[PDB]
């Protein structure tokens, strides 16, 4: 170990996936047939959280303008 | 530029919804501001990249090829270069030939 | 505006304008914007 | 491959820019050191 | 409808997941609005503006 | 031209084959000469119009919207028209304003 | 129609492959016929027969 220190010597799944891809597509065409919108929920969800931030921003303002103690 | 093969595009209308593709937040929002109702965008939670569902009734441009009829021109000979006369690279890339 | 002020000053200095006779500057672009091409012509019309 | 030579500097320096512009008789002289033609303050508004 | 349902089940894909999260946030909207409507009442419209 | 809403397009790649649309013989052939292997065209026997199956790996341009930052200009007043001075319509449509 | 299409896509099965090869050969038919129609003209019907 002293000698070593001086000289510098050291001492499967692309089938189950491909199945899921089909089902995904098969679902999609049925959704299209039914005029059923899958993402409708999340769209309305994203909309409301924008108004959450908006109301929170108005709330955070008045908390700042009055102080925590005043509001409570 | 190959005058037998001229890049041109036509304004067409999407009949049926496209399959999503990936793009940056900035990029996606640029699509949304353009098309509005006729496109949807979603945060893919893991990456932070956005999916782009282009929808029915959206406007697209599809390339096509005009066969043009003036194939000949008096052209400065092949291998002519501003390099050979003594012009430096910083000047060439900056400037219209 | 820095450059243009400088060059007119140096013109007036070199030619020995009487001390306390400044040239008066009209800046027509403030009201008309920059018609980049027609710039001088409007300034011409104005001057007349 | 040196027919084109991008000139580094103006024949006048930045301090003499104004003075050169205002002497119509100011010509260029061979600079002793550099060996390129520079305007010299001796030949600007010169009696000679 | 039924044929879609079984595929959704196969994919472990939840159709209503969106609306659930949507209903949740509008409850917090009413909540924040109630807190906002209160302070508007306690201070007067003119004070807030 | 609305400077808040600037039409621009991105070169994208088709992941999955599109749904056919109708176009003239001339028009279809212009697509085929452009894309070659990545598009198919067929005579629809009754009409004599052609179907356009744009295929996987084809190149498309999708419009998008830049939000630009210079919103103001010195503009010739609204309702100014060469008509009112006496210029005729044949001259106006022919010529750059 | 759509349900068929996605299965064709899944199977990497090309429906139009036939007609493509069909359109190709009828172009060579016209080509050979044009060469045949030429020699019939250059020699006369009687000579060829």
Curated annotation (Swiss-Prot), chains B, F:
The species this protein was found in: Saccharomyces cerevisiae (strain ATCC 204508 / S288c) (Baker's yeast)
Residues shown, of full length: 1114 to 1210 of 1887
Domain of life: Eukaryota
Modification after translation: 4'-phosphopantetheine is transferred from CoA to a specific serine of the Acyl carrier domain by the C-terminal PPT domain. This modification is essential for activity because fatty acids are bound in thioester linkage to the sulfhydryl of the prosthetic group.
Residues in coiled coil: none
Cysteine-cysteine disulfides: none
Miscellaneous field: Present with 17000 molecules/cell in log phase SD medium.
Protein name from the UniProt record: Fatty acid synthase subunit alpha
Homology family: Belongs to the thiolase-like superfamily. Fungal fatty acid synthetase subunit alpha family.
Subunit structure, interactors included: [Alpha(6)beta(6)] hexamers of two multifunctional subunits (alpha and beta).
Protein task: Fatty acid synthetase catalyzes the formation of long-chain fatty acids from acetyl-CoA, malonyl-CoA and NADPH. The alpha subunit contains domains for: acyl carrier protein, 3-oxoacyl-[acyl-carrier-protein] reductase, and 3-oxoacyl-[acyl-carrier-protein] synthase. This subunit coordinates the binding of the six beta subunits to the enzyme complex.
From Swiss-Prot, chain D:
Residues annotated as signal peptide: none
Post-translational modifications: 4'-phosphopantetheine is transferred from CoA to a specific serine of the Acyl carrier domain by the C-terminal PPT domain. This modification is essential for activity because fatty acids are bound in thioester linkage to the sulfhydryl of the prosthetic group.
Homology family: Belongs to the thiolase-like superfamily. Fungal fatty acid synthetase subunit alpha family.
Subunit structure: [Alpha(6)beta(6)] hexamers of two multifunctional subunits (alpha and beta).
Main function: Fatty acid synthetase catalyzes the formation of long-chain fatty acids from acetyl-CoA, malonyl-CoA and NADPH. The alpha subunit contains domains for: acyl carrier protein, 3-oxoacyl-[acyl-carrier-protein] reductase, and 3-oxoacyl-[acyl-carrier-protein] synthase. This subunit coordinates the binding of the six beta subunits to the enzyme complex.
Note: Present with 17000 molecules/cell in log phase SD medium.
Name of this protein: Fatty acid synthase subunit alpha
Organism, scientific name: Saccharomyces cerevisiae (strain ATCC 204508 / S288c) (Baker's yeast)
UniProtKB/Swiss-Prot annotation, chains E, G:
Protein name as catalogued: Fatty acid synthase subunit alpha
Species classification: Eukaryota, Fungi, Dikarya, Ascomycota, Saccharomycotina
PTM text: 4'-phosphopantetheine is transferred from CoA to a specific serine of the Acyl carrier domain by the C-terminal PPT domain. This modification is essential for activity because fatty acids are bound in thioester linkage to the sulfhydryl of the prosthetic group.
Highest taxon listed in the record's lineage: Eukaryota
Homology family: Belongs to the thiolase-like superfamily. Fungal fatty acid synthetase subunit alpha family.
Full protein segment contained here: 340 to 388 of 1887
Record's function text: Fatty acid synthetase catalyzes the formation of long-chain fatty acids from acetyl-CoA, malonyl-CoA and NADPH. The alpha subunit contains domains for: acyl carrier protein, 3-oxoacyl-[acyl-carrier-protein] reductase, and 3-oxoacyl-[acyl-carrier-protein] synthase. This subunit coordinates the binding of the six beta subunits to the enzyme complex.
More about this protein: Present with 17000 molecules/cell in log phase SD medium.
Gene: FAS2
Subunit structure: [Alpha(6)beta(6)] hexamers of two multifunctional subunits (alpha and beta).
Organism: Saccharomyces cerevisiae (strain ATCC 204508 / S288c)
């Amino acid at each position: 170990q002293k000698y070593a220190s001086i000289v510098g010597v050291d001492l499967l799944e692309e089938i189950t996936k491909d199945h899921k891809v089909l089902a995904r597509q098969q679902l999609q065409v049925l959704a299209r047939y039914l005029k059923m919108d899958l993402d409708n929920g999340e769209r309305k969800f994203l909309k409301e959280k924008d108004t959450v931030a908006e109301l929170q921003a108005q709330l955070d303002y008045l908390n700042a303008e009055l102080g925590e103690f005043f509001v409570n | 530029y190959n005058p037998e093969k001229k890049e041109m595009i036509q304004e067409v209308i999407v009949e049926e919804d496209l399959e999503p593709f990936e793009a940056s937040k900035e990029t996606a929002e640029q699509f949304k501001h353009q098309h509005g109702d006729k496109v949807d965008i979603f945060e893919i939670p893991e990456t932070g990249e956005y999916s782009v569902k282009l929808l029915k009734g959206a406007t697209l441009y599809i390339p096509k090829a005009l066969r043009f009829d003036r194939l000949v021109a008096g052209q400065i000979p092949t291998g002519w270069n501003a390099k050979t006369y003594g012009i430096s690279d910083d000047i060439i890339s900056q400037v219209d030939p | 505006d820095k450059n243009e002020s400088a060059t007119i000053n140096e013109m007036m200095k070199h030619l020995g304008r009487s001390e306390g006779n400044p040239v008066i500057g009209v800046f027509q672009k403030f009201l008309t914007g920059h018609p980049k091409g027609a710039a001088g012509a409007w300034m011409m019309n104005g001057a007349l | 491959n040196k027919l084109f030579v991008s000139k580094e500097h103006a024949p006048y320096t930045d301090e003499l820019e104004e003075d050169v512009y205002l002497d119509p008789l100011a010509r260029v002289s061979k600079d002793k050191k550099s060996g390129s033609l520079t305007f010299n303050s001796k030949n600007i508004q010169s009696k000679d």
